[PDB]
Short mmCIF file of C-alpha atoms and ligand atoms in Angstrom, two decimals:
data_model
loop_
_atom_site.label_atom_id
_atom_site.label_comp_id
_atom_site.label_asym_id
_atom_site.label_seq_id
_atom_site.Cartn_x
_atom_site.Cartn_y
_atom_site.Cartn_z
CA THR O 3 0.00 0.00 0.00
CA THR O 4 1.10 3.56 -0.84
CA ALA O 5 -0.48 6.82 0.31
CA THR O 6 -1.19 8.65 -2.96
CA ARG O 7 -2.78 11.99 -3.80
CA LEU O 8 -5.25 10.76 -6.44
CA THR O 9 -7.94 12.48 -8.50
CA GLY O 10 -10.75 12.07 -11.02
CA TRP O 11 -10.08 12.96 -14.66
CA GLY O 12 -11.03 16.58 -14.02
CA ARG O 13 -7.79 17.24 -12.06
CA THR O 14 -10.20 18.50 -9.36
CA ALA O 15 -10.90 17.89 -5.65
CA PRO O 16 -7.66 16.12 -4.54
CA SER O 17 -8.02 13.40 -1.91
CA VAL O 18 -5.23 11.39 -0.25
CA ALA O 19 -5.77 7.63 0.15
CA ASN O 20 -3.78 4.43 0.65
CA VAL O 21 -3.73 2.66 -2.73
CA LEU O 22 -3.37 -1.10 -3.22
CA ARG O 23 -1.75 -2.43 -6.39
CA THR O 24 -1.77 -6.25 -6.49
CA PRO O 25 -2.64 -8.86 -9.15
CA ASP O 26 -3.32 -11.42 -6.42
CA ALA O 27 -7.11 -11.58 -6.12
CA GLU O 28 -6.85 -13.48 -2.83
CA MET O 29 -4.64 -10.66 -1.49
CA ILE O 30 -7.41 -8.19 -2.42
CA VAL O 31 -9.91 -10.12 -0.27
CA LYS O 32 -7.58 -9.93 2.76
CA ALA O 33 -7.49 -6.11 2.80
CA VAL O 34 -11.27 -5.81 2.33
CA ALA O 35 -11.84 -8.42 5.05
CA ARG O 36 -9.24 -6.50 7.10
CA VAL O 37 -11.24 -3.25 6.78
CA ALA O 38 -14.33 -4.97 8.24
CA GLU O 39 -12.04 -6.09 11.08
CA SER O 40 -11.19 -2.40 11.53
CA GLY O 41 -15.00 -2.04 11.50
CA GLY O 42 -14.80 1.72 11.01
CA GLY O 43 -15.26 4.72 8.74
CA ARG O 44 -13.01 5.54 5.78
CA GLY O 45 -13.95 2.35 3.95
CA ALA O 46 -12.62 0.91 0.71
CA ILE O 47 -13.37 1.69 -2.93
CA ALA O 48 -12.34 -0.01 -6.17
CA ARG O 49 -10.54 1.99 -8.88
CA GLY O 50 -10.18 1.40 -12.62
CA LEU O 51 -8.21 3.71 -14.91
CA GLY O 52 -9.48 6.96 -13.35
CA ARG O 53 -11.36 8.21 -16.42
CA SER O 54 -14.30 9.48 -14.37
CA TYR O 55 -14.06 13.24 -13.80
CA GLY O 56 -15.86 12.78 -10.49
CA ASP O 57 -14.91 11.71 -6.99
CA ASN O 58 -16.45 8.25 -7.34
CA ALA O 59 -13.02 6.57 -7.51
CA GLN O 60 -11.35 8.35 -4.55
CA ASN O 61 -11.78 7.80 -0.81
CA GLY O 62 -9.93 10.45 1.22
CA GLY O 63 -8.31 8.96 4.32
CA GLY O 64 -9.69 5.56 3.32
CA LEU O 65 -8.51 2.74 1.08
CA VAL O 66 -8.41 2.59 -2.73
CA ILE O 67 -7.95 -0.71 -4.59
CA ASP O 68 -6.45 -0.22 -8.05
CA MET O 69 -7.96 -3.09 -10.04
CA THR O 70 -5.83 -2.54 -13.17
CA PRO O 71 -3.33 -5.36 -12.43
CA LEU O 72 -6.19 -7.90 -12.74
CA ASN O 73 -6.17 -7.84 -16.54
CA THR O 74 -6.39 -11.56 -17.35
CA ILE O 75 -8.68 -12.60 -20.20
CA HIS O 76 -9.92 -16.11 -19.36
CA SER O 77 -12.05 -17.23 -22.26
CA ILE O 78 -13.59 -15.90 -25.45
CA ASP O 79 -16.12 -18.00 -27.37
CA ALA O 80 -17.24 -17.12 -30.92
CA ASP O 81 -20.12 -19.61 -30.83
CA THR O 82 -21.59 -18.46 -27.50
CA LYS O 83 -20.45 -14.85 -28.19
CA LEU O 84 -19.30 -14.80 -24.55
CA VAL O 85 -16.07 -13.34 -23.21
CA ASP O 86 -14.86 -13.99 -19.66
CA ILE O 87 -12.51 -11.41 -18.16
CA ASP O 88 -11.26 -10.04 -14.84
CA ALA O 89 -12.70 -6.63 -13.91
CA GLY O 90 -9.37 -4.85 -14.60
CA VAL O 91 -9.34 -5.61 -18.33
CA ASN O 92 -9.65 -2.41 -20.36
CA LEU O 93 -11.99 -2.07 -23.34
CA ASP O 94 -9.13 -1.38 -25.77
CA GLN O 95 -7.38 -4.68 -24.98
CA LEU O 96 -10.72 -6.54 -24.89
CA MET O 97 -11.56 -5.23 -28.37
CA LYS O 98 -8.14 -6.24 -29.73
CA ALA O 99 -8.53 -9.76 -28.34
CA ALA O 100 -12.09 -10.26 -29.61
CA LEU O 101 -11.84 -8.96 -33.19
CA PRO O 102 -10.13 -12.18 -34.41
CA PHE O 103 -13.21 -14.03 -33.06
CA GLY O 104 -15.58 -11.98 -35.24
CA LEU O 105 -16.77 -10.15 -32.12
CA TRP O 106 -17.29 -6.51 -31.14
CA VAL O 107 -17.56 -4.71 -27.82
CA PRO O 108 -21.32 -4.08 -27.32
CA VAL O 109 -20.92 -0.64 -25.70
CA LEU O 110 -17.93 1.61 -26.36
CA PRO O 111 -17.55 5.08 -24.80
CA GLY O 112 -15.69 8.21 -26.00
CA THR O 113 -12.41 6.94 -24.57
CA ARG O 114 -11.33 3.31 -24.91
CA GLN O 115 -9.17 3.44 -21.78
CA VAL O 116 -11.82 2.19 -19.33
CA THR O 117 -11.91 -1.02 -17.27
CA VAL O 118 -14.69 -3.63 -17.38
CA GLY O 119 -15.32 -2.80 -13.71
CA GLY O 120 -15.53 0.92 -14.52
CA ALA O 121 -17.82 0.19 -17.48
CA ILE O 122 -20.26 -1.77 -15.29
CA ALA O 123 -20.22 0.45 -12.19
CA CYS O 124 -20.96 3.59 -14.22
CA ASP O 125 -23.17 1.58 -16.62
CA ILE O 126 -21.42 3.40 -19.47
CA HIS O 127 -23.36 4.46 -22.55
CA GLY O 128 -22.17 5.06 -26.10
CA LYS O 129 -22.85 6.23 -29.65
CA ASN O 130 -25.22 3.26 -30.01
CA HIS O 131 -27.39 3.48 -26.85
CA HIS O 132 -30.55 3.86 -28.93
CA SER O 133 -29.94 0.52 -30.63
CA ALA O 134 -27.88 -1.38 -28.04
CA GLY O 135 -28.47 0.17 -24.61
CA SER O 136 -26.05 0.60 -21.72
CA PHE O 137 -23.08 -1.58 -20.76
CA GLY O 138 -25.20 -3.35 -18.11
CA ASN O 139 -27.54 -4.71 -20.80
CA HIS O 140 -24.75 -7.07 -21.90
CA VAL O 141 -23.32 -8.34 -18.64
CA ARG O 142 -24.52 -11.95 -18.61
CA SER O 143 -22.70 -12.62 -15.34
CA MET O 144 -20.39 -11.02 -12.78
CA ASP O 145 -18.58 -12.08 -9.62
CA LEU O 146 -18.72 -9.55 -6.78
CA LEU O 147 -16.65 -9.38 -3.61
CA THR O 148 -19.17 -8.28 -0.98
CA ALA O 149 -18.62 -6.75 2.48
CA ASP O 150 -18.90 -10.09 4.33
CA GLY O 151 -15.83 -11.45 2.51
CA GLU O 152 -17.93 -13.77 0.34
CA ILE O 153 -17.76 -13.65 -3.46
CA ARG O 154 -21.25 -13.84 -4.98
CA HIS O 155 -22.05 -14.91 -8.54
CA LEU O 156 -24.58 -12.47 -9.96
CA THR O 157 -26.99 -12.80 -12.90
CA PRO O 158 -29.34 -10.41 -14.77
CA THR O 159 -32.50 -12.56 -14.55
CA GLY O 160 -31.29 -14.93 -11.81
CA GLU O 161 -32.23 -15.18 -8.13
CA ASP O 162 -29.76 -12.44 -7.13
CA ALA O 163 -30.97 -10.01 -9.82
CA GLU O 164 -31.57 -7.32 -7.18
CA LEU O 165 -27.90 -7.02 -6.17
CA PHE O 166 -26.92 -7.40 -9.85
CA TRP O 167 -28.82 -4.30 -10.99
CA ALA O 168 -27.67 -2.37 -7.93
CA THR O 169 -24.04 -3.04 -8.94
CA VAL O 170 -24.86 -1.95 -12.49
CA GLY O 171 -24.45 1.83 -12.26
CA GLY O 172 -23.80 1.48 -8.51
CA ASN O 173 -20.45 3.34 -8.62
CA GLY O 174 -18.65 0.42 -6.94
CA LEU O 175 -20.59 0.96 -3.73
CA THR O 176 -22.04 -2.57 -3.68
CA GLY O 177 -18.55 -4.08 -3.65
CA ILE O 178 -15.57 -4.94 -5.83
CA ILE O 179 -16.31 -6.63 -9.16
CA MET O 180 -13.71 -9.34 -9.74
CA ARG O 181 -14.75 -11.13 -12.91
CA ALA O 182 -17.48 -10.65 -15.49
CA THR O 183 -19.08 -12.37 -18.48
CA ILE O 184 -20.12 -10.12 -21.37
CA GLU O 185 -22.14 -11.07 -24.45
CA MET O 186 -20.48 -9.48 -27.49
CA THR O 187 -22.01 -8.10 -30.68
CA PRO O 188 -21.27 -10.42 -33.63
CA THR O 189 -19.36 -8.67 -36.42
CA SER O 190 -18.40 -9.57 -39.98
CA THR O 191 -15.79 -6.76 -39.98
CA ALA O 192 -13.98 -4.10 -37.92
CA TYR O 193 -15.24 -1.25 -40.13
CA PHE O 194 -18.17 1.18 -40.28
CA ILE O 195 -20.48 2.30 -43.07
CA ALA O 196 -20.98 5.96 -42.19
CA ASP O 197 -23.62 8.53 -43.12
CA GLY O 198 -23.09 12.26 -42.53
CA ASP O 199 -25.46 15.23 -42.26
CA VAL O 200 -25.12 18.95 -41.42
CA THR O 201 -27.86 21.05 -39.80
CA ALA O 202 -28.42 24.83 -39.78
CA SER O 203 -30.27 25.35 -36.47
CA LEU O 204 -31.35 23.68 -33.20
CA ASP O 205 -34.78 22.98 -34.72
CA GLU O 206 -33.24 21.27 -37.75
CA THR O 207 -31.06 19.20 -35.40
CA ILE O 208 -34.08 18.07 -33.35
CA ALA O 209 -36.14 17.48 -36.52
CA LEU O 210 -33.56 15.03 -37.92
CA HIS O 211 -33.44 13.22 -34.57
CA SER O 212 -37.19 12.72 -34.37
CA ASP O 213 -38.12 12.27 -38.06
CA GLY O 214 -37.25 8.55 -37.98
CA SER O 215 -33.77 8.49 -39.53
CA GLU O 216 -32.40 7.13 -36.23
CA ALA O 217 -34.04 3.78 -37.08
CA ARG O 218 -31.75 3.39 -40.11
CA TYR O 219 -28.61 3.57 -37.94
CA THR O 220 -27.25 1.67 -34.94
CA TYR O 221 -24.61 4.33 -34.22
CA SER O 222 -25.50 8.02 -33.90
CA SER O 223 -24.05 11.22 -32.38
CA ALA O 224 -23.29 14.85 -33.30
CA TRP O 225 -20.96 17.80 -32.66
CA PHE O 226 -23.07 20.86 -31.97
CA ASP O 227 -22.63 24.65 -31.79
CA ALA O 228 -23.33 26.22 -28.39
CA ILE O 229 -21.70 29.64 -28.89
CA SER O 230 -23.48 31.19 -31.89
CA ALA O 231 -26.75 33.02 -31.25
CA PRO O 232 -30.16 31.92 -32.59
CA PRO O 233 -30.93 30.76 -35.18
CA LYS O 234 -27.42 29.27 -35.57
CA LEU O 235 -27.45 28.07 -31.96
CA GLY O 236 -27.77 24.28 -32.06
CA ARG O 237 -26.45 23.65 -35.58
CA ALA O 238 -24.70 20.28 -35.78
CA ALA O 239 -22.46 17.93 -37.74
CA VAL O 240 -24.12 14.52 -37.42
CA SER O 241 -22.25 11.21 -37.78
CA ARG O 242 -24.35 8.04 -38.06
CA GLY O 243 -23.93 4.46 -39.29
CA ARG O 244 -23.56 0.75 -38.59
CA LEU O 245 -20.98 -2.06 -38.45
CA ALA O 246 -20.06 -3.08 -41.98
CA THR O 247 -20.10 -6.56 -43.53
CA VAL O 248 -17.43 -8.11 -45.79
CA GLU O 249 -19.35 -7.51 -49.05
CA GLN O 250 -19.80 -3.84 -48.08
CA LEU O 251 -16.03 -3.39 -47.66
CA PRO O 252 -13.93 -2.63 -50.76
CA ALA O 253 -12.14 -5.71 -52.17
CA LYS O 254 -8.70 -4.36 -51.17
CA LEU O 255 -9.85 -4.49 -47.53
CA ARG O 256 -11.75 -7.76 -48.07
CA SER O 257 -8.41 -9.46 -47.32
CA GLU O 258 -8.77 -8.97 -43.57
CA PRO O 259 -12.23 -7.69 -42.51
CA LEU O 260 -11.42 -7.92 -38.78
CA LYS O 261 -8.08 -6.07 -39.04
CA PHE O 262 -7.46 -2.98 -36.94
CA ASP O 263 -5.17 -0.84 -39.10
CA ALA O 264 -3.32 1.66 -36.90
CA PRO O 265 -3.69 5.44 -37.53
CA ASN O 266 -9.63 31.75 -45.37
CA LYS O 267 -12.14 34.43 -46.44
CA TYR O 268 -14.90 31.94 -47.35
CA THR O 269 -15.05 30.06 -44.01
CA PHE O 270 -17.54 32.35 -42.22
CA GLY O 271 -19.28 33.46 -45.43
CA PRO O 272 -22.26 31.81 -47.20
CA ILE O 273 -19.92 29.68 -49.35
CA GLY O 274 -18.17 28.57 -46.15
CA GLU O 275 -21.53 27.41 -44.77
CA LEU O 276 -22.14 25.63 -48.09
CA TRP O 277 -18.68 24.00 -48.21
CA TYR O 278 -19.01 22.78 -44.63
CA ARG O 279 -22.49 21.47 -45.47
CA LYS O 280 -21.39 19.30 -48.41
CA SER O 281 -18.16 18.13 -46.73
CA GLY O 282 -20.24 17.13 -43.69
CA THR O 283 -22.79 15.41 -45.93
CA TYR O 284 -21.77 11.93 -47.12
CA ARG O 285 -23.32 8.56 -47.92
CA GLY O 286 -22.10 5.05 -47.05
CA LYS O 287 -18.51 6.03 -46.25
CA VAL O 288 -16.34 3.06 -45.22
CA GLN O 289 -14.36 4.07 -42.14
CA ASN O 290 -11.93 2.90 -39.48
CA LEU O 291 -13.04 2.70 -35.87
CA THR O 292 -10.60 5.60 -35.35
CA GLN O 293 -12.03 7.58 -38.30
CA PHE O 294 -15.63 6.99 -37.17
CA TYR O 295 -15.53 6.90 -33.37
CA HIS O 296 -12.27 7.94 -31.66
CA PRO O 297 -11.12 10.74 -34.06
CA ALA O 298 -7.77 20.17 -16.03
CA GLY O 299 -8.83 23.84 -16.25
CA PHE O 300 -12.18 22.81 -17.74
CA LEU O 301 -15.46 21.45 -16.37
CA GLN O 302 -17.35 18.89 -18.42
CA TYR O 303 -21.11 18.95 -17.81
CA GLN O 304 -23.41 16.17 -18.96
CA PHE O 305 -27.17 15.90 -18.63
CA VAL O 306 -30.10 14.27 -20.41
CA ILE O 307 -33.62 15.68 -20.79
CA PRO O 308 -36.63 13.33 -21.40
CA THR O 309 -37.61 12.99 -25.08
CA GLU O 310 -41.06 14.60 -24.78
CA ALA O 311 -39.53 17.64 -23.05
CA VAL O 312 -38.46 19.10 -26.41
CA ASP O 313 -39.18 22.80 -25.69
CA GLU O 314 -37.70 22.82 -22.19
CA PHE O 315 -34.62 21.17 -23.69
CA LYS O 316 -34.46 24.00 -26.28
CA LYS O 317 -34.81 26.44 -23.38
CA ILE O 318 -31.77 25.13 -21.47
CA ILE O 319 -29.58 25.26 -24.61
CA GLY O 320 -30.63 28.91 -25.01
CA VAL O 321 -29.69 29.48 -21.36
CA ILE O 322 -26.17 28.04 -21.79
CA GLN O 323 -25.48 30.19 -24.86
CA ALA O 324 -26.82 33.24 -23.01
CA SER O 325 -24.68 32.77 -19.88
CA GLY O 326 -21.43 33.86 -21.55
CA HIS O 327 -19.71 30.57 -20.74
CA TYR O 328 -18.39 29.31 -24.06
CA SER O 329 -18.15 25.56 -24.67
CA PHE O 330 -16.58 24.29 -27.91
CA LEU O 331 -16.54 20.51 -27.32
CA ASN O 332 -20.23 19.59 -27.46
CA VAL O 333 -21.67 16.09 -27.96
CA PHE O 334 -25.34 15.56 -28.81
CA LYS O 335 -27.22 12.27 -28.82
CA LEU O 336 -30.74 10.89 -28.39
CA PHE O 337 -30.74 7.98 -25.90
CA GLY O 338 -33.04 5.01 -26.51
CA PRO O 339 -34.82 2.89 -23.82
CA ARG O 340 -33.39 2.86 -20.28
CA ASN O 341 -32.64 -0.37 -18.39
CA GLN O 342 -33.72 -1.59 -14.93
CA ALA O 343 -30.75 -0.43 -12.83
CA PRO O 344 -32.06 2.06 -10.21
CA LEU O 345 -28.92 4.23 -10.41
CA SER O 346 -28.55 4.05 -14.20
CA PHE O 347 -27.81 7.41 -15.85
CA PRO O 348 -29.36 7.04 -19.30
CA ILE O 349 -33.10 7.47 -19.89
CA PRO O 350 -34.72 8.02 -23.31
CA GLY O 351 -34.03 11.63 -24.23
CA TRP O 352 -31.73 14.45 -25.22
CA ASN O 353 -28.15 13.91 -24.10
CA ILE O 354 -25.76 16.88 -24.03
CA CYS O 355 -22.04 17.06 -23.25
CA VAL O 356 -20.62 20.53 -22.73
CA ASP O 357 -17.12 21.54 -21.62
CA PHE O 358 -16.86 24.84 -19.72
CA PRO O 359 -13.59 26.72 -19.08
CA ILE O 360 -13.22 27.41 -15.34
CA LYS O 361 -13.84 31.10 -14.60
CA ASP O 362 -15.59 33.29 -12.00
CA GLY O 363 -19.30 32.50 -11.61
CA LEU O 364 -19.26 29.12 -13.36
CA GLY O 365 -19.85 27.11 -10.17
CA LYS O 366 -22.97 29.17 -9.50
CA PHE O 367 -24.16 29.00 -13.12
CA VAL O 368 -23.98 25.18 -13.27
CA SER O 369 -25.87 25.04 -9.96
CA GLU O 370 -28.64 26.81 -11.88
CA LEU O 371 -28.41 24.22 -14.66
CA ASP O 372 -28.69 21.45 -12.07
CA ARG O 373 -31.91 23.23 -11.07
CA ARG O 374 -33.39 23.26 -14.58
CA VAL O 375 -32.27 19.73 -15.51
CA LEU O 376 -33.94 18.49 -12.31
CA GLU O 377 -36.99 20.68 -13.01
CA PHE O 378 -37.36 19.38 -16.58
CA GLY O 379 -37.30 15.76 -15.32
CA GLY O 380 -33.68 15.00 -16.25
CA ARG O 381 -30.48 13.90 -14.49
CA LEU O 382 -26.68 14.16 -14.23
CA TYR O 383 -23.96 11.53 -14.76
CA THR O 384 -22.02 10.40 -11.66
CA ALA O 385 -19.00 9.78 -13.90
CA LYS O 386 -18.91 13.47 -14.87
CA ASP O 387 -20.07 14.91 -11.54
CA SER O 388 -17.75 16.35 -8.89
CA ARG O 389 -19.84 19.18 -7.40
CA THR O 390 -23.66 18.69 -7.42
CA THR O 391 -25.48 18.48 -4.06
CA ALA O 392 -26.93 15.35 -2.43
CA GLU O 393 -30.44 16.83 -2.46
CA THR O 394 -30.30 17.73 -6.18
CA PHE O 395 -29.02 14.23 -7.03
CA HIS O 396 -31.57 12.41 -4.83
CA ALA O 397 -34.43 14.17 -6.58
CA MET O 398 -32.95 13.41 -10.02
CA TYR O 399 -32.95 9.68 -9.25
CA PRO O 400 -36.48 8.77 -7.99
CA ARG O 401 -35.40 5.19 -7.24
CA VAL O 402 -32.52 6.24 -4.95
CA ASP O 403 -34.24 4.85 -1.82
CA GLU O 404 -34.67 1.53 -3.64
CA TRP O 405 -30.93 1.48 -4.38
CA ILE O 406 -29.85 2.52 -0.89
CA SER O 407 -32.03 -0.26 0.61
CA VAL O 408 -30.00 -2.80 -1.38
CA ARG O 409 -26.66 -1.21 -0.45
CA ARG O 410 -27.70 -1.06 3.23
CA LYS O 411 -28.54 -4.78 3.15
CA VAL O 412 -25.33 -5.92 1.43
CA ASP O 413 -22.98 -3.44 3.13
CA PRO O 414 -24.41 -2.36 6.54
CA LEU O 415 -20.96 -1.74 8.09
CA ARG O 416 -20.23 0.79 5.31
CA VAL O 417 -17.13 -1.16 4.23
CA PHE O 418 -17.36 0.29 0.71
CA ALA O 419 -17.22 4.10 0.80
CA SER O 420 -16.05 6.89 -1.52
CA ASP O 421 -15.81 10.70 -1.63
CA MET O 422 -18.91 10.74 -3.86
CA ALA O 423 -20.90 8.38 -1.62
CA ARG O 424 -20.40 10.73 1.33
CA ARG O 425 -21.02 13.85 -0.78
CA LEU O 426 -24.26 12.48 -2.29
CA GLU O 427 -25.24 10.69 0.97
CA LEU O 428 -25.69 7.26 -0.64
CA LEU O 429 -24.21 5.30 2.29
C1 FAD P 514 -12.21 11.40 -22.80
C2 FAD P 514 -13.31 10.67 -22.07
C3 FAD P 514 -14.46 10.29 -22.77
C4 FAD P 514 -15.49 9.62 -22.12
N1 FAD P 514 -16.59 9.27 -22.82
C5 FAD P 514 -17.61 8.61 -22.22
C6 FAD P 514 -18.83 8.21 -22.97
O1 FAD P 514 -18.93 8.47 -24.19
N2 FAD P 514 -19.80 7.56 -22.32
C7 FAD P 514 -19.71 7.26 -21.01
O2 FAD P 514 -20.66 6.66 -20.47
N3 FAD P 514 -18.63 7.59 -20.26
C8 FAD P 514 -17.57 8.25 -20.78
N4 FAD P 514 -16.44 8.60 -20.02
C9 FAD P 514 -16.37 8.26 -18.59
C10 FAD P 514 -15.93 6.82 -18.36
O3 FAD P 514 -16.31 6.00 -19.47
C11 FAD P 514 -16.55 6.22 -17.11
O4 FAD P 514 -16.43 7.11 -16.00
C12 FAD P 514 -15.92 4.87 -16.76
O5 FAD P 514 -16.82 4.15 -15.91
C13 FAD P 514 -14.59 5.02 -16.04
O6 FAD P 514 -13.85 3.81 -16.15
P1 FAD P 514 -12.48 3.63 -15.33
O7 FAD P 514 -11.94 2.27 -15.69
O8 FAD P 514 -11.62 4.86 -15.50
O9 FAD P 514 -13.00 3.57 -13.80
P2 FAD P 514 -12.74 4.74 -12.72
O10 FAD P 514 -13.02 6.09 -13.31
O11 FAD P 514 -11.40 4.48 -12.09
O12 FAD P 514 -13.92 4.41 -11.66
C14 FAD P 514 -15.28 4.67 -12.00
C15 FAD P 514 -16.26 4.09 -10.98
O13 FAD P 514 -16.42 2.69 -11.18
C16 FAD P 514 -16.07 1.96 -10.00
N5 FAD P 514 -15.28 0.76 -10.35
C17 FAD P 514 -14.27 0.69 -11.24
N6 FAD P 514 -13.77 -0.57 -11.31
C18 FAD P 514 -14.46 -1.33 -10.46
C19 FAD P 514 -14.45 -2.75 -10.04
N7 FAD P 514 -13.57 -3.62 -10.58
N8 FAD P 514 -15.36 -3.14 -9.10
C20 FAD P 514 -16.24 -2.28 -8.56
N9 FAD P 514 -16.31 -0.98 -8.89
C21 FAD P 514 -15.46 -0.45 -9.82
C22 FAD P 514 -15.28 2.91 -9.12
O14 FAD P 514 -15.52 2.65 -7.74
C23 FAD P 514 -15.78 4.28 -9.55
O15 FAD P 514 -16.91 4.65 -8.75
C24 FAD P 514 -15.38 9.29 -20.66
C25 FAD P 514 -14.23 9.67 -19.97
C26 FAD P 514 -13.19 10.35 -20.61
C27 FAD P 514 -11.97 10.74 -19.83
N1 N77 P 515 -20.39 13.33 -23.13
O1 N77 P 515 -19.52 13.21 -22.05
C1 N77 P 515 -20.20 12.52 -24.26
C2 N77 P 515 -21.23 11.75 -24.80
C3 N77 P 515 -21.02 10.94 -25.93
C4 N77 P 515 -22.17 10.14 -26.48
F1 N77 P 515 -23.08 10.97 -26.97
F2 N77 P 515 -21.75 9.35 -27.45
F3 N77 P 515 -22.71 9.41 -25.52
C5 N77 P 515 -19.77 10.86 -26.58
C6 N77 P 515 -18.68 11.58 -26.12
C7 N77 P 515 -18.87 12.44 -24.92
S1 N77 P 515 -17.47 13.25 -24.48
C8 N77 P 515 -16.57 12.52 -25.78
C9 N77 P 515 -15.15 12.99 -25.86
O2 N77 P 515 -14.20 12.32 -25.49
N2 N77 P 515 -15.09 14.22 -26.37
C10 N77 P 515 -14.00 15.16 -26.62
C11 N77 P 515 -12.65 14.72 -27.15
C12 N77 P 515 -11.56 15.52 -26.78
C13 N77 P 515 -10.29 15.19 -27.23
C14 N77 P 515 -10.13 14.07 -28.04
N3 N77 P 515 -11.19 13.32 -28.39
C15 N77 P 515 -12.44 13.61 -27.97
N4 N77 P 515 -17.38 11.72 -26.50
O3 N77 P 515 -16.94 11.09 -27.48
#
């Protein structure tokens, strides 16, 4: 163990905790079982690759278990479509291993550098949520080290389904995931057929997302403008598509379908708008995973607003543009059907990712966004959150009492605690 000053991805809210780095799973149990012997506050929390901007992976004055050295891939089956990996396997290595099997990772996020454990405990969502769902929708099994010292096999529709769905999106507060079984998406190739569209306004962006085009694509997301004033506010470059098949690939890349090949004055004028429009408009473009998907002093803010709340979603975008806080990196998506995890972030609706530069009055401004998001029936993402209040969060997640009841039953001693847990009063 080493006392380290660790952080979320946001470089924010430093906390000092004793970190454990061991590949011995049995060793991991000893420390957890030792903490219950200490029978006191400052519990233990698991940690993946620290890609969450929040304080969900730190436990100040407590214990942190870095799960990254448990990166053994046990089995991959192309017939069953099942992989079996330890919770410290990252999604980049898992993808690499599975492509030769004709398999694809069911849910991939913006970054590839996330653990299986991290992917489950934040129930990560991706460019394909509307066609595939969250990461938890694909976990066919997982083994969880609970507070009692026991390791419990968990299943989605099994007898222990309650504790399963509480661990899905449960920010590691149910226990430490050790090993999981994930059903993969079958794939003919490692390429994408891509379809591109450019919009001129927020209305035209929303129109395209509710006209029915979404049905044609399994993957969908868009870069959007949040600086320009109406009507240009909300204009977007949309990138949509699906996993390609061999026959769809050009013959020169038919060789190895499952290969992962390694990587003015007009601009603002009417011709610039026209040039950008045609260059952003394309049909059936064959692309790499890099080309399609993965092309400190900031604060990333992510919220979703229920689908039917179209106008109140348009209102909050107008607010952000009006506030004088300028965000350039903006991701727009329309989530499909939510799952049955109480603490799951995604619900069907209008997902926004904004990235604000830290400056005077931002903390207070985003507290006013928290207010509107909550008011318009939406929620925030624990993975992105470092500074919302417990009260605001509890109201955003109506099933929070349902989740806490599970966590109280499985971990009454409060063996598993984190900075977030205390902040959002989930213990
Ligand atoms: C550039 C970038 C882009 C991103 N894009 C997306 C995106 O498109 N969609 C999206 O949903 N998210 C996105 N994220 C956030 C990230 O995908 C999630 O926060 C992810 O869960 C973090 O994985 P991690 O391995 O870093 O885990 P950490 O950040 O280290 O931990 C995350 C949480 O999971 C718990 N946990 C981790 N491992 C285990 C385990 N073995 N057992 C029990 N609990 C565990 C921890 O306790 C902690 O609460 C992005 C992050 C970055 C930096
Ligand atoms: N929001 O956090 C978010 C949401 C989504 C999706 F809509 F697909 F769910 C995708 C997404 C983000 S943030 C993100 C990202 O990493 N963006 C910025 C970036 C900066 C530097 C280099 N590459 C990307 N992605 O993809």
